[PDB]
Design a protein around this ligand. Structure first.
Ligand code: MG
Ligand code: ZN
Ligand code: ZN
Ligand code: ZN
Lengths: 214, 307, 168, 164, 112, 114
């Protein structure tokens, strides 16, 4: 076939990756849901003959009981899939206003292609609500499933403070990690957060390490 | 420990030797990055659902390899065909009545000639390349082509026009030859496939050298080769670890780097202990990003002015 | 020992015969044209493979002949010095000389050295030192041996400075 | 319907142009119309692939080589199958087909690359597997005062070691 | 190599390895201890098979056991006749006691 | 694809088109002489070249010593003397073809076995 099948499958896999993004970020999603088969996805999201309708394909999500139990403050997140290959200033303005109205603090936005700076200059507006941008090309393959990437987990502020008091560091002697890192963007963390890293060592098997997102 | 590790890596680099780069210069590059390639190869593992299907492996090769008209064009010639709807060349009449079953064009025929082997090695039937250039422009070029079943493969094209046409046609065909992608992702060149094997766990709980086929290249790209079908996206791997770092995060970056340095220093004169190498990797990666030990790289840290 | 020497000689002779057969096939333009490689590359690979197999076989033959009272055997199986390849090169055959993988190239046009007619690929013309250190070398082979040794020396003289800098 | 009648006109022209001029003109135009409906059974003027398949079949009828296909379609070759063939590579003619398989076989041979094969001996044993399938090499790395390196390469499991 | 059965038939020990081996053939308590130890072992096997994906078993590790038990034999004169006076409870408690008395990180908190 | 020069002044004729009768007028640009060409072929590329293997056959090859000598016969004169050498067009992907030239018949012949 021509490009329709590639477009369908790419959109399907990007949906898979975004779903597991949200799942390991700490928002409860049924385990069956992430392996939703492609033909079922198309049956859910075919309009006339082969066209996928991304506008209604987005969805809301809720923090788990467990993620609330540790982290006291996460509101509902919300995802987006605009259909224009470009990015419209009024389109994202409606998006950010809708986030403000629905009282959301984390807004997932996915673009087909490039974003004009006018449609992304006001992304850092409305604190404490934060807006995050993603390409489907960057989301067609889940990064964490690569076997060279170790497990990453998030630290609460309390246990981070405990870590500092135990190893007697001061906040700058930790090894760093970029904000623009792929796994950092996958987790969505921001400045001043600590990621515990579990990797499969060869002289002890299992080994711990921490980084700082500065 | 640091001095111990440094000496333990330094001395067996002295008794080490000097296709693919190796030896002293490769070690200098990977210790001194210097994002230059000289062998930018990256190994590609197939989907396990295609264990040994050679046709499948070739199909993935044809999906992945970059090709332009240079890959497919045998012969190019120019012609003055005055008749806009008939041919001075005797053979190109059946093609005309195929495409005749919208007139104001220059009577300056451009002719191409391809290789059937160079088409169907990559499963490019010439029908989609004809419509490919047709959709590439759709505005300036009539594009008329043969059937794939002929004994000679020709593309007929004329410029439509609402003097001097020789050099415009020369520039146009130069651009045609150079820039029209056909299939595959750019910066990937001729790709070969080897027959490897892997000590896979046996179903009765043992180990066996079960073979499988691997795709191997001579260029580098990452943001697309992960995205092609029929591939294992997990176990992909590249020698150029800077791109690994950029796409996968510096944890995978330092793991790939350790793999690379171990490969270089264990090509001969193995082995040093693991912990020294790990310490070198970690002190070279403990900044959130790769930091070559140059006159400037680690030197321009917030460190003591005297050292 | 005499009979073992005779076997060494005939072993190298049949290796030469295999090489000549390959050259005839190549010059008759029918070859398999080994995959991944160009025609001349395949030819060079085949001939170098044959010659190195010949050297190995001859060296093994000499070693398994060699008596238990032989002192270089005593040291070499006693650890300290010497090697299988040292025994082989002192007694049986030197082997094909080398200048970065390819054997000795035509510095002169179409020939390796001005004592042969043009366009040869027989191993003695391009540099197979068939002979052995006991019998000494024909002067052409002596020259090719000098080539290989010079290559080793210059490689050492550059690698030492570069490895010192990187160590520092 | 213009495309319908145009395809019909082309089909009537190419079957009237056959060496077997069929006196069964109504039967052969019935063949033409039934090929028209089974052809439009794919898309019926909804996709350009209909035109592409039209080009394929039209030029295959024209080609000469081969001419015998005209008689074979006139006396058989039931066309509803020939909507769903997409089998132009396996028709018109057999010598070109044989050419195609030998081309494909040579291409598959040229795809897979270098296979250098590491000539062995049987004297040493593996450092890990401990079996005798050992392969080597010679060169000297360090300064002139010492001999070669005596590189090792096991082949029973792929191990590498070295001897002084 | 490792699985022991004390109440079943196929993997039953020979009772002449230990003088108190006959009477303990049937105790559920020792059977439970052996079974959970065996589960521990197989979990370790799965863990190693997922960390060394090839299956290489020779690895650099600290203090060698084999020489130690060998010279233990050659010091204390093991024989071929006397059943050992070792008891199963003694073995499986002693291994865990050594397991904890190994010490690399001194400390008192959860992280350490 | 060869060049035709203006006979009136030695400059190659250029392709230029009749605006009304539609003919290939190779016109001179230096002077005003014009010429009608023969075929609509004008420009020609040859993206793949495979020619040159028998280069430089001079009439007196046999005067050189360094060429080897053999015993195949010239299949025109059957003289047992001959001279052979490698293909001349030195690319990395040429062949081991031997070209035999005999001194008697002064005639070249190869030994291809396809
Ligand atoms: Mg300082
Ligand atoms: Zn082995
Ligand atoms: Zn003139
Ligand atoms: Zn003759």
């Amino acid at each position: 076939d021509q490009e329709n099948e590639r477009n369908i499958s790419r959109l399907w896999r990007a949906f898979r990756t975004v779903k597991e993004m949200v799942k390991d970020r700490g928002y409860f999603i049924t385990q069956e849901e992430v392996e939703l088969p492609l033909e079922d996805f198309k049956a859910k999201y075919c309009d006339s003959m082969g066209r996928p309708q991304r506008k209604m394909m987005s969805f809301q999500a809720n923090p788990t009981e467990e993620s609330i139990s540790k982290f006291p403050d996460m509101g509902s997140l919300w995802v987006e899939f605009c259909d224009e290959p470009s990015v419209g200033v009024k389109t994202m303005k409606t998006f950010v206003i809708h986030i403000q109205e629905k009282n959301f603090q984390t807004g997932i936005f996915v673009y087909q292609n490039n974003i004009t700076p006018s449609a992304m200059k006001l992304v850092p507006s409305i604190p404490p609500a934060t807006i995050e941008t993603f390409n489907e090309a960057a989301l067609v393959v889940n990064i964490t499933h690569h076997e060279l990437v170790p497990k990453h987990i998030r630290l609460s502020s309390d246990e981070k403070r405990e870590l500092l008091k135990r190893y007697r560091l001061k906040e700058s002697q930790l090894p760093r990690i970029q904000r623009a890192d792929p796994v950092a963007l996958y987790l969505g963390l921001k400045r001043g957060e600590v990621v515990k890293i579990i990797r499969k060592s060869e002289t002890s098997g299992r080994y711990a390490s921490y980084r700082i997102c500065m | 420990v640091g001095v111990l590790a440094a000496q333990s890596i330094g001395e067996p680099a002295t008794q080490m030797t000097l296709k693919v780069t190796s030896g002293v210069p490769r070690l200098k590059e990977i210790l001194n990055v210097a994002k230059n390639m000289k062998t930018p190869s990256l190994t590609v593992y197939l989907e396990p659902g295609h264990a040994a299907d050679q046709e499948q492996a070739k199909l993935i090769r044809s999906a992945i390899e970059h090709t332009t008209l240079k890959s497919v064009t045998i012969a190019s010639e120019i012609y003055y065909d005055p008749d806009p709807r008939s041919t001075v060349i005797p053979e190109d009449e059946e093609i005309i009545q195929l495409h005749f079953s919208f007139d104001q064009q220059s009577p300056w025929l451009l002719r191409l000639e391809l290789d059937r082997a160079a088409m169907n090695d990559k499963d490019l039937t010439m029908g989609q390349v004809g419509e490919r250039i047709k959709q590439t422009f759709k505005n300036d070029l009539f594009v008329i082509w043969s059937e794939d079943n002929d004994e000679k493969l020709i593309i007929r094209c004329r410029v439509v026009r609402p003097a001097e046409e020789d050099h415009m046609l020369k520039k146009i065909e130069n651009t045609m030859l150079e820039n029209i992608t056909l299939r595959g992702v750019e910066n990937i060149e001729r790709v070969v496939m080897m027959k490897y094997d892997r000590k896979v766990p046996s179903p009765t709980g043992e180990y066996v050298k079960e073979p499988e086929w691997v795709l191997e290249t001579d260029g580098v790209n990452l943001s697309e080769v992960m995205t092609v079908p029929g591939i294992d996206p997990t176990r992909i791997y590249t020698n150029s670890f800077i791109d690994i770092m950029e796409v996968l995060g510096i944890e995978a970056g330092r793991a790939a780097l350790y793999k690379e340095v171990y490969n270089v220093i264990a090509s001969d004169g193995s082995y040093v202990n693991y912990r020294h190498m790990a310490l070198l990797v970690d002190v070279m990666t403990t900044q959130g990003g790769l930091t070559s030990v140059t006159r400037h790289g680690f030197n321009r840290s917030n460190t003591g002015a005297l050292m | 020992d005499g009979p073992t020497m005779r076997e060494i000689t005939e072993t190298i002779a049949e290796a030469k015969k295999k090489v000549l057969d390959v050259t005839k096939e190549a010059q008759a333009n029918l070859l398999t044209a080994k995959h991944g490689m160009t025609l001349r590359e395949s030819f060079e690979d085949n001939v170098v493979r044959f010659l190195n197999e010949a050297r190995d076989k001859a060296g093994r033959l000499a070693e398994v002949n060699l008596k238990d009272l032989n002192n270089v055997k005593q040291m070499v199986m006693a650890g300290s010095k010497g090697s299988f390849i040292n025994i082989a090169q002192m007694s049986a055959c030197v082997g094909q000389q080398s200048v970065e993988g390819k054997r000795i190239a035509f510095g002169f046009v179409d020939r390796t050295l001005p004592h042969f007619s043009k366009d040869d690929y027989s191993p003695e013309s391009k540099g197979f030192v068939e002979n052995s250190y006991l019998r000494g070398l024909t002067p052409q082979e002596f020259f090719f041996h000098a080539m290989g040794g010079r290559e080793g020396l210059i490689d050492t003289a550059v690698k030492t400075a570069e490895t010192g800098y990187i160590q520092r | 319907h213009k495309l319908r009648d145009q395809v019909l006109k082309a089909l009537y022209d190419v079957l009237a142009k056959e060496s077997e001029h069929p006196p069964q003109s109504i039967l052969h135009t019935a063949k033409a119309i039934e090929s028209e409906m089974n052809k439009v059974n794919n898309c019926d003027t909804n996709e350009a692939a209909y035109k592409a398949r039209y080009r394929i079949i039209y030029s295959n009828v024209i080609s000469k080589n081969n001419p015998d296909l005209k008689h074979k379609i006139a006396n058989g070759d039931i066309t509803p199958e020939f909507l769903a063939t997409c089998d132009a590579k396996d028709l018109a003619p057999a010598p070109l087909k044989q050419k195609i398989e030998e081309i494909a076989k040579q291409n598959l041979y040229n795809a897979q690359g270098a296979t250098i094969e590491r000539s062995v001996t049987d004297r040493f044993t593996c450092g890990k597997c401990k079996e005798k399938k050992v392969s080597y090499y010679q060169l000297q790395t360090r300064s002139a005062d010492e001999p070669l390196t005596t590189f090792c390469t096991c082949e029973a499991c792929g191990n590498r070691w070295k001897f002084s | 190599r490792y699985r022991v059965d004390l109440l079943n038939t196929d993997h039953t020990l020979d009772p002449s390895l230990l003088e108190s081996g006959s009477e303990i053939l049937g105790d559920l308590k020792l059977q439970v201890l052996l079974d959970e130890e065996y589960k521990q072992l197989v979990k370790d096997r799965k863990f190693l098979r997922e960390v060394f994906v090839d299956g290489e078993a020779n690895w650099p590790l600290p203090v060698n056991i084999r020489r130690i038990i060998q010279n233990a034999q050659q010091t204390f004169h093991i024989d071929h006749t006397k059943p050992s006076d070792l008891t199963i409870k003694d073995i499986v408690l002693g291994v865990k006691d050594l397991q904890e008395n190994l010490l690399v990180l001194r400390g008192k908190n959860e992280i350490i | 694809t060869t060049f035709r020069f203006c006979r009136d002044c030695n400059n190659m004729l250029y392709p230029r088109e009749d605006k009304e009768n539609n003919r290939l007028l190779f016109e001179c640009r230096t002077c005003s002489y014009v010429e009608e060409a023969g075929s609509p072929l004008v420009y020609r590329h040859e993206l793949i070249t495979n020619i040159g293997e028998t280069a430089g056959v001079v009439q007196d090859i046999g005067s050189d010593p360094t060429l080897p000598r053999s015993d195949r016969e010239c299949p025109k004169c059957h003289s047992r003397e001959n001279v052979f050498f490698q293909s001349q067009q030195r690319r990395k992907d040429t062949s081991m073809v031997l070209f035999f030239v005999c001194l008697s018949c002064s005639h070249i012949f190869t030994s291809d076995q396809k």
